[PDB]
RNA sequence: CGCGACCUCAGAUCAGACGUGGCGACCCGCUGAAUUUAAGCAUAUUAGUCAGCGGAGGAGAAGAAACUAACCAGGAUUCCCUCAGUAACGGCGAGUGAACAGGGAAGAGCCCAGCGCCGAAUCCCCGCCCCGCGGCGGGGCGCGGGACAUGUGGCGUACGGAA
RNA sequence: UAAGGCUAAAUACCGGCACGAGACCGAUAGUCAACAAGUACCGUAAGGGAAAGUUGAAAAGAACUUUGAAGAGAGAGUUCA
RNA sequence: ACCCACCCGACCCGUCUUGAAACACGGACCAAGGAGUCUAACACGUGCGCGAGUCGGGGGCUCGCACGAAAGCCGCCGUGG
RNA sequence: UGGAGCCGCCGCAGGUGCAGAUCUUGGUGGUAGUAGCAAAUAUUCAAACGAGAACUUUGAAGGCCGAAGUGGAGAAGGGUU
RNA sequence: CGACUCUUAGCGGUGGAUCACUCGGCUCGUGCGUCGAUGAAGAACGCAGCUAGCUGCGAGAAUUAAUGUGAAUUGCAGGACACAUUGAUCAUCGACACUUCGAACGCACUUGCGGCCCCGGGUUCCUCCCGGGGCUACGCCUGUCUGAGCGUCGCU
């Protein structure tokens, strides 16, 4: 909005940190079932806890 | 709809009864638990009868049962008074005492005095300390039995 | 290289602080070095220094709190920290002496009419 | 049979217990027999295998009478890597092939103090049981 | 449901009758052999032994 | 710098002065959309920033 | 107009993040939640939503105090002692 | 008494339940009195109450309360039963002399409902299909 | 126009304590439907059941007869088997529906007020010492405070009790 | 013998911690959920609520040569396959 | 039993219906899933045991149950039905 | 073909046999390379990059929005665009 | 023969039935039966050398101490350590620690405003200013201090 509270800004920050894709060294771990992050949120489609 | 002959019968399954069905898959597990707990209690009350205290003889009520005789709840005060056992003490030697029992007829009374007398004969009161004062029995009747009595103590047989 | 709990226990209070400071300094430089590449060889230390820092701080708090409960062991009113936490309800049980207070009437009863060890059939 | 009513004998329970076992417990699981030679000497059937014991592989492809030194113990993978027990990958690089500890025999132990005290404890219990049986 | 009538209760004499019937045919080599038991070389069929 | 989010400019100023034996003209904080309070710290003109920068490691 | 054109003017919000329960259900005008009833001293739970009941029972979260209490109890609520040292 | 809290009348339902005016609470006023004294002084543990008068509009009562954690109560053995945590909120559970009376329990033929612990418990006993193993 | 008792009331970030929310399978107190059945429906039934509110404990509640009975009488409470789909209720329709006895599981009984006697013989908190201190206790010593005669403590409570 | 009070035990336990078992289900079953599930996702909100197990004994997961911008191939190789 | 030919025969199933190839409804195709269950009470029939009796519950005695939460026994054998 | 368990007989037990339920979940056709990719006047030439240009970029021309703008800035909403 | 169409079979696709597995459920049982102002449950935000999710933890943040164990952890790095030494790694968990909301407590929910005591820079108690620390919810009980009343008395 460009007029944020601090509460909201911090919320957004964490959401922004969560988006990154898996580190590829994770795929090489021993008992690995994970191939892709599957919790990736694109701003244009799917619109936050808000 | 009824079809040709049968008891015009009323079942009581109109409330939500399946919400309150009470199964019995416990029961074996229960039966054991009681039994362990029973054997533990014996072992705790070491030479004392497993039974409990001694209990009076007593006739049932009503015309129906009338003829039979059970164990009652506890010996009346008159019965203790006549036997000559102080009521407060009688509890301490394993004699059941209720005090709410009347005593109408003298046939039921003298029988129940006789019971207590007999009990007091065949009772083995241990002394408080290993050093032996009055009342406490001989070390003969002590070594020869610190034995529990299995089953109800002096059982009533109609 | 290794900072152990072992040795720190005996050390003087001012000496423990200098050591913490000197680790806090060493942590800073590695954090600086993590930004500017640095080297894997440096970026190990950062974990090590962190835990040695904790090892120091821990020893200090253990020493401060041991001394503290020496100081109150005897006094009736003592800080909530130093009072023994068991479980809310368990800190409202009866006192351990208060729940074995017999009434004189009950004591007299136990004196006059004690349960006796007895057996039957002899 | 097993009569102790607190053990399990339940496939799912035993396997879950196994695969989700914690390192120190895996140490015990990853044990391996001594050579008849040592079996005679120490009075011990078997021992928890360790980083640099000397060892024969008894079964499989690498089954052989050579005595390779242990290389590492991958307790996550329930496996040990052994000196010349290896295989050339596509691009020439050697790769330490896993052998399960139980399909191996310890010819030479790596004796430290603690390993020494372990062997003293196991031998003593064995001889107590023989004395009880006699 | 749990309260399916799982357990099944049998008259006591009948239970005994069965147990007598089984005993009686633990004799009879034919009935023992037919039940599969290789009892070819056994010395006597109601096989009773010393009490050591 | 990156700074702890709870900090005042007063605290930062005091920290920067304490750690690097330095002295500050002014601190000028913001918050990154990421969460880490950044701090631009103008040093007083007796001091050169590139000189301290070389001291602390960065360049 | 009742539909698509009117979805156009959903410019402003009813609820925000409640600060007890965390849900985006704190109604700004009412200044209550409607999830935990925030200002309300006691938590909101209803016996009709058994699914809702389960979504934030105890187990659900960290149980950071409660999980070490269970351990403490197990071994016997011993306090202020150590194991025999080396 | 107790008028039925429903808007206007509008106890929508079968005209058995249409009543709103002439109907009467289960507990007594004296119990309500205790319950309120109990509510207010949470630490305090309601022992018992008595009556001190009545206007048309009000009744008056006097609820005896006790600190369970005052040493003079704690250390006196004959009272220290109230300091036990089963006796938290007696009045709320229907356990003072007053709130006992609504429960409808006494020995003898004039009761039977409440021939387990309480009213609810007897119903519970009487409406359990005991379903035995062997049947 | 004071000073002093008490009574009833305030205020303290006064000293020291407690209560608040949670969980809710089981438990205690309230509150309380309507689908439904009756081949319609209004009493009835569904049901003192769901939802609603309150309060607990490891269990809760109950409990030591203002009881049963009508016998040659039983003798607190709880639980099981039975009583019994019985006595009874009911548009006497649908439907609903206990108890005593009897046999078991268990088993344990007690305390006040009052009435009286006893120099309040009682209690709480201070402070100093010795022990003990991770369930704040013992013992001693203080003209150190207060509660209390508008009644604390010992004896005693119907099974009688006191002298 | 009412209008004051306390009391263990046999009794209850679809919540909790910790175990044991099964003539049960065997991935459209069995819990909504064998998996990063009360997750993703939807709804202003109360609330709603999925799908989804399996290379091989071992990764030995295809070096190298060649066609193509590449994805893709053709040979070669690994594997008992 | 695969295909083809020819002669004769031969309307599409399910269903409700007096009457369906119907201008009556359901049905594009394939896979997996998918509906007379369990408890209680009654009645009659049949099988077995005992028989003017019969009965087993409930309880108890015998075990840490591996198989047992079985099996066995009870002046409780009959309070009681 | 597959690669690790499975069946006959005598008894017992059941969540035991599908074509239909505008049945449930998953998959696949014919329809079909069909309908369709038509609101708001407009494109053209050369070059660059590049494997590759109707669509990128640069230059040149021709056009439109025509300051109640297809321009220049905010509010709310989005949340890194 | 030609194309197309239909049928059957071979092989290949599509699709994921079947079968075989099962660190999951479902049911029955046993024992125990423990949350919270000493701050619960729940929520938030943080914390890894490379880590997004799940988990684990709390600015001592994939954990500190202690005790038991006795060489690993391992996707890669890097390292440590002398694994003849309190000693890697797991387990236990009694010591220590435990950010912010939350019954939730200085008052407010902006993360805004405060008061009162002490400490360091600031002063040289000059109050300011900055930083740190400790207090500052409501209700209620036992006492304590200060009181109020043409409430009931006494003496003056
Ligand atoms: Mg959008
Ligand atoms: Mg008995
Ligand atoms: Mg007394
Ligand atoms: Mg009605
Ligand atoms: Mg009355
Ligand atoms: Mg509460
Ligand atoms: Mg009707
Ligand atoms: Mg009808
Ligand atoms: Mg109608
Ligand atoms: Mg009714
Ligand atoms: Mg309810
Ligand atoms: Mg109770
Ligand atoms: Mg009474
Ligand atoms: Mg009775
Ligand atoms: Mg009958
Ligand atoms: Mg009724
Ligand atoms: Mg008196
Ligand atoms: Mg009571
Ligand atoms: Mg699946
Ligand atoms: Mg599947
Ligand atoms: Mg499923
Ligand atoms: Mg499958
Ligand atoms: Mg597959
Ligand atoms: Mg499959
Ligand atoms: Mg194959
Ligand atoms: Mg019809
Ligand atoms: Mg017709
Ligand atoms: Mg037809
Ligand atoms: Mg026609
Ligand atoms: Mg039709
Ligand atoms: Mg159709
Ligand atoms: Mg099928
Ligand atoms: Mg018949
Ligand atoms: Mg296989
Ligand atoms: Mg089945
Ligand atoms: Mg089908
Ligand atoms: Mg076209
Ligand atoms: Mg712009
Ligand atoms: Mg073909
Ligand atoms: Mg599938
Ligand atoms: Zn909320």
Give your account of this protein's structure:
The structure is cut from a larger assembly and holds 8 protein chains of 8 kinds. Chain A is 26% helix and 0% strand. By secondary structure, chain A is mainly alpha-helical. Chain A is elongated. Chain A has one helix at residues 6-18. Chain C has 122 residues and is mainly α. Chain C has helices at 5-8, 13-35, 40-72, 104-112; one strand at 118-120. In chain C, α2 packs antiparallel against α3. In chain E, 37% of the residues lie in helices and 0% in strands. Chain E has helices spanning 12-24, 29-34. Chain E starts with 11 loop residues before the first helix and ends in an 18-residue tail after the last helix. By secondary structure, chain H is of the alpha+beta class. In chain H, a hairpin with a 4-residue loop joins β1 and β2 (59-64). Chain H starts with 28 loop residues before the first helix and ends with a strand. The E-H interface holds E 3, 5-9 and H 131, 133-135. β1 of chain B pairs parallel with β3 (129-131) of chain H. One magnesium ion is lined by residues 14, 16 of chain H. Chain H binds 5 RNA strands through α1, α2, α3, α4 and α5. The PDB classes it as protein transport. The entry lists the keywords Protein translocon of the endoplasmic reticulum, protein transport. The entry is titled "Subtomogram average of OST-containing ribosome-translocon complexes from canine rough microsomal membranes". Chain A is eL39. The organism of A is Oryctolagus cuniculus. Chain B is eL13.
Label this structure with key terms:
part of a larger assembly, 8 chains, A: 50 residues, mainly alpha, 1 helix, 26% helix, 0% strand, elongated, F: 59 residues, alpha+beta, two-stranded antiparallel ribbon, 32% helix, globular, binds magnesium ion, binds zinc ion, RNA-binding, Large ribosomal subunit protein uL29 (chain C), acetylation (chain C), ribonucleoprotein (chain C)
Q: Helical percent range of chain A?
A: 25-40%
**Main β-sheet description of chain A:** none
The best one-word shape of chain H is flat
Largest sheet geometry of chain H: 2 strands, antiparallel
Q: Which radius of gyration of chain A do the C-alpha atoms yield?
A: 15 Å
SS field, number of helical segments of chain A: 1
Largest contact between chains: B-C, 26 and 11 residues
Question: Which structural class do the helices and strands of chain H define?
Answer: alpha+beta
List the helices and strands and how they pair.
This is part of a larger assembly, with 8 protein chains of 8 kinds.
Chain B: E1 21-23, H1 27-44, E2 57-59, H2 62-65, E3 69-71, H3 77-83, H4 87-90, H5 106-121, E4 123-125, H6 140-143
Antiparallel strand pairs in B: 2-3
Chain F: H1 9-19, E1 24-31, E2 37-43, H2 49-56
Antiparallel strand pairs in F: 1-2
Chain H: H1 29-40, E1 48-54, E2 59-64, H2 71-75, H3 90-93, H4 97-101, H5 119-126, E3 129-131
Antiparallel strand pairs in H: 1-2
Bound molecules: magnesium ion (MG) (40 copies) and zinc ion.
Chain H binds 5 RNA strands through helix 1, helix 2, helix 3, helix 4 and helix 5.
Family (chain G): Belongs to the eukaryotic ribosomal protein eL37 family.
Subcellular location (chain G): Cytoplasm
Function (chain G): Component of the large ribosomal subunit. The ribosome is a large ribonucleoprotein complex responsible for the synthesis of proteins in the cell.
């Amino acid at each position: 909005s460009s007029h944020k509270t601090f509460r909201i800004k911090r919320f957004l920050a964490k959401k922004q940190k969560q988006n990154r894709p898996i580190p590829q060294w994770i795929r090489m771990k021993t008992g690995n079932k994970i191939r892709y992050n599957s919790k990736r949120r694109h701003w244009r489609r799917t619109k936050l806890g808000l | 709809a009824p079809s040709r002959n049968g008891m015009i019968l009323k079942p009581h399954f109109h409330k939500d009864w399946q919400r309150r069905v009470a199964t019995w898959f416990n029961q074996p597990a229960r039966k054991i638990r009681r039994r362990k707990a029973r054997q533990a209690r014996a072992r705790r009350i070491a030479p004392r009868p497993a039974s409990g205290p001694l209990r009076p003889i007593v006739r049932c009520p009503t015309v129906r049962y009338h003829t039979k005789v059970r164990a009652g709840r506890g010996f009346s005060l008159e019965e203790l008074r006549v036997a000559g056992i102080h009521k407060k003490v009688a509890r301490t030697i394993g004699i059941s005492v209720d005090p709410r029992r009347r005593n109408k007829s003298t046939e039921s009374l003298q029988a129940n005095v006789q019971r207590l007398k007999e009990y007091r004969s065949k009772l083995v009161l241990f002394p408080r300390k290993p050093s032996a004062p009055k009342k406490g029995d001989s070390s003969a009747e002590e070594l020869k039995l610190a034995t529990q009595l299995t089953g109800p103590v002096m059982p009533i047989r109609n | 290289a290794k900072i152990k709990a072992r040795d720190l226990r005996g050390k003087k209070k001012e000496e423990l602080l200098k050591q913490l400071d000197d680790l806090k300094v060493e942590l800073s430089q590695l954090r600086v070095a993590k930004v500017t590449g640095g080297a894997a060889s440096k970026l190990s230390k950062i974990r090590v220094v962190r835990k040695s820092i904790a090892r120091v701080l821990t020893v200090i708090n253990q020493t401060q709190k041991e001394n503290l409960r020496k100081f109150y062991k005897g006094k009736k009113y003592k800080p909530l920290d130093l009072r023994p936490k068991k479980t809310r309800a368990m800190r409202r049980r009866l006192n351990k002496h208060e729940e074995s207070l017999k009434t004189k009437k009950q004591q007299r009863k136990e004196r006059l009419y004690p349960l006796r060890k007895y057996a039957v059939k002899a | 049979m097993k009569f102790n009513p607190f053990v399990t004998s339940d496939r799912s329970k035993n396997r879950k217990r196994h695969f989700n076992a914690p390192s120190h417990i895996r140490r015990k699981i990853m044990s391996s027999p001594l050579s008849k030679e040592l079996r005679q000497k120490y009075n011990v059937r078997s021992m928890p295998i360790r980083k640099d014991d000397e060892v024969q592989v008894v079964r499989g492809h690498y089954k052989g009478q050579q005595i390779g030194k242990v290389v590492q113990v991958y307790r996550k993978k329930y496996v040990i890597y052994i000196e010349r027990v290896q295989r050339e990958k596509a691009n020439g690089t050697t790769v330490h092939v896993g052998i399960h500890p139980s399909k191996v025999v310890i010819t030479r132990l790596k004796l430290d103090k603690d390993r020494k005290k372990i062997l003293e404890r196991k031998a003593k219990s064995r001889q107590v049981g023989k004395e009880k049986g006699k | 449901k749990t309260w399916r009538r799982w357990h099944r209760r049998v008259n006591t004499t009948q239970k005994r009758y069965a147990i007598c019937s089984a005993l009686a045919a633990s004799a009879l080599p034919a009935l023992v052999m037919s039940k599969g038991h290789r009892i070819e070389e056994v010395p006597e069929l109601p096989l009773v032994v010393e009490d050591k | 710098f990156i700074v702890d989010v709870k900090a005042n400019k007063h605290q930062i100023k005091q920290a920067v002065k304490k750690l690097y034996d330095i002295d500050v003209a002014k601190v000028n904080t913001l918050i990154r959309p990421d969460g880490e309070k950044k701090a631009y710290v103008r040093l007083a003109p007796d001091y050169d920033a590139l000189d301290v920068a070389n001291k602390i490691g960065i360049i | 107009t009742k539909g698509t054109s009117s979805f156009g003017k959903r410019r402003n919000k009813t609820h925000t993040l409640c600060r007890r329960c965390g849900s985006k259900a704190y109604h700004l005008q009412k200044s209550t939640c409607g999830k935990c009833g925030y200002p309300a001293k006691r938590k909101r739970k209803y016996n009709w939503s058994a699914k809702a009941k389960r979504r934030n029972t105890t187990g659900t979260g960290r149980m950071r105090h409660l999980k070490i209490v269970y351990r403490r109890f197990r071994h016997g609520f011993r306090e202020g002692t150590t194991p025999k040292p080396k | 008494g107790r008028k039925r809290p429903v808007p206007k009348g509008a106890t929508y339902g079968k005209p058995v339940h249409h009543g709103v005016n002439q109907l009467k609470f289960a507990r007594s006023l004296q119990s309500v009195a205790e319950e309120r004294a109990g509510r207010h002084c949470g630490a305090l543990r309601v022992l018992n109450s008595y009556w001190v008068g009545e206007d048309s509009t009000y009744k008056f009562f006097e609820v005896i309360l006790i600190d369970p954690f005052h040493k003079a109560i704690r250390r006196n053995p004959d009272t220290q039963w109230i300091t036990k945590p089963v006796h938290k909120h007696r009045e709320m559970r229907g356990l003072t002399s007053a709130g006992r009376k609504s429960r409808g329990l006494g020995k003898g033929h004039k009761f039977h409902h409440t021939i387990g612990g309480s009213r609810r418990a007897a119903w519970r006993r009487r409406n359990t299909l005991q379903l035995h193993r062997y049947r």
